[PDB]
Amino acid sequence: MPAKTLESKDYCGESFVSEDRSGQSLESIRFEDCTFRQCNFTEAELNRCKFRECEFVDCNLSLISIPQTSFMEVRFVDCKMLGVNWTSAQAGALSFERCILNDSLFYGLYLAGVKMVECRIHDANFTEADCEDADFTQSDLKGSTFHNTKLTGASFIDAVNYHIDIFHNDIKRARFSLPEAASLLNSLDIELS
Amino acid sequence: KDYCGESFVSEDRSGQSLESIRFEDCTFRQCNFTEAELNRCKFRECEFVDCNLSLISIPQTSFMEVRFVDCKMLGVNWTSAQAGALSFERCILNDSLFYGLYLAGVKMVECRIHDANFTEADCEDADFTQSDLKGSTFHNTKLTGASFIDAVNYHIDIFHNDIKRARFSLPEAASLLNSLDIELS
């Protein structure tokens, strides 16, 4: 059953529940303090939209296209978000909680402080990204690409499956866990015990 | 002044200068060379067992196929040395200088090696098995394919020392991650 038409280019305090927006083009809409429950945005285009203090819960955002869209103070909770190109977007004080970010593109992205806690993150690409102080507490990073990724001060406590060549990624003051941290040496072709 | 195929036993040359002497195929047993000086001497296929070579001075001197076993060799300055296929087994090498020295394949096995300087040395395929490297300086040291199996108290900054294909034992090998400035749990 069709969703309310989004006539405005400004929304505020508004709640959006169980709406199917797949395939929709939203053009230059600004949302502030809006909540999104059980919404579907599969393959929507959020073109030049702005999101400030907003929250997404139980929403599917897979293959969403976010060209020149900003998220500032946005929280994503139990969201599916595969294959998203973030490369053109602006992120700031982003939080992801138990999201699935498989295959996402973060090349070059400024992500200082990002929270990606308890997330499935396979084959996501973080090349040239700024991830200072990023918090990957307990995420699965299997097959994700770290390369000239600034990782200074980031947390990989209880994270798993992270391949980080330490010659091409700054990890000063990064927090790690044992035994998982051992993978940091793989960068050296060293034989162990 | 040339010597081939001799065994020298309990000779004392402490604090003496020896000049342009060539040894080939010679054994030294319980010989004292503390503080001796070996100007321009030469050693080919020679063995020292239980000999004291502490503070020996070896200006412009050469060591090819020389085994040291159970020898005190403290504070020796090897910076000058010419050296090939050197082995040290169960020796004390504390405070020695191996500055910039070519040491491919050297064996320093079961040795005490406190406060030695390996800065700029090439120690490719070096064998440090069972040695105590406490306080020794590895800086710009080629450690490619070197073995630290069962070695202890080695501090190696993996950013300023090449360890491609080197071998380590857990748990000592964890000290490697300190080259990194990280917090562990």
Pick from B142, B133, B144, B141: nearest CA to B175: B133
Residue B157 zone, left/alpha/beta (φ > 0; ψ -120 to 50; rest)? beta
Nearest CA in chain A to B159: A167
Cβ–Cβ < 8 Å for B88, B110:
no
What are the tokens at B172?
């000592």
The runs of H, that is alpha helices, within A9-96 are none
Resolution attained, angstroms: 2.4
Of the partner residues A175, A185, A191, the one whose CB lies closest to the CB of residue B167: A191
d(CA B156, CA A33): 52
Identify the helix (H) or strand (E) that includes residue B86: strand B82-89
Of B159, B164, B182, the CB nearest to A189: B164
Q: How far apart are CA B19 and CA B24, in angstroms?
A: 16
Cα dihedral across residues A25, A26, A27, A28: positive or negative: negative
Sequence-ordered list of residues with C-beta below 8 angstroms from that of B59, at least 6 positions apart, any chain: B37, B38, B39, B40, B80
- Contact criterion met (CB < 8 Å) for B183 and A173: yes
Q: Chain B interface residues facing chain A, Cβ-Cβ under 8 Å?
A: 158-159, 163-170, 173, 176-177, 180-185
CA distance A146 to A131: 10
Tally of CB atoms within 10 A around B156: 25
Determined by which method? X-ray
Name every chain A residue with its beta carbon within 8 A of the beta carbon of B180: 166, 171-172, 174, 184
- B185·A175 Cβ contact <8 A: yes
Nearest chain A CA: its distance from B71 CA (Å): 29
* Measured distance CA(A180)–CA(A193) in Å, rounded: 16
Fold annotation for B1-185: Pectate Lyase C-like (2.160.20)
Tokens matching residue A121: 């993150």
Minimal-distance CA residue of chain A relative to B168: A192
CA–CA–CA angle A54, A55, A56 (5° rounding) = 130
Q: How far is A177 from chain B (nearest CA, A)?
A: 5
CA dihedral for A152, A181, A80, A45, sign (positive or negative): positive
- Domain A1-193 coded CATH 2.160.20.80: yes
Say yes or no for a CB contact (<8 Å) between A191 and B165.
Answer: yes
User: Is there a contact between B166 and A193 if contact means CB atoms under 8 Å apart?
Assistant: no
Distance (Å, whole) CA A148 – CA A155: 17
Distance between CA atoms of A92 and A69, rounded to whole angstroms?
A: 12
Q: How far is A172 from chain B (nearest CA, A)?
A: 5
**Contact by Cβ (8 Å): B112, B131:** yes
CB A101 within 8 A of CB A118: no
- Point out which residues pair with A120 in neighbouring strands: A100, A140
Residue of A nearest to B171 (CA): A193
Task: Find the Cα–Cα–Cα–Cα dihedral A92, A98, A103, A106, rounded to 10°.
Answer: 10
Pick from B26, B25, B22, B63: nearest CA to B41: B22
Distances (CA, A) of A172 to A166, B91, B137, B160: 10, 38, 23, 15
At residue A192, φ and ψ (nearest 5 deg) are -115, 150
Q: Would the CB atoms of A178 and B184 count as touching at under 8 Å?
A: yes
B168: chain A residues, CB-CB within 8 Å:
190-193
Task: Say how many Å lie between the first and final Cα of chain A, rounded.
Answer: 62
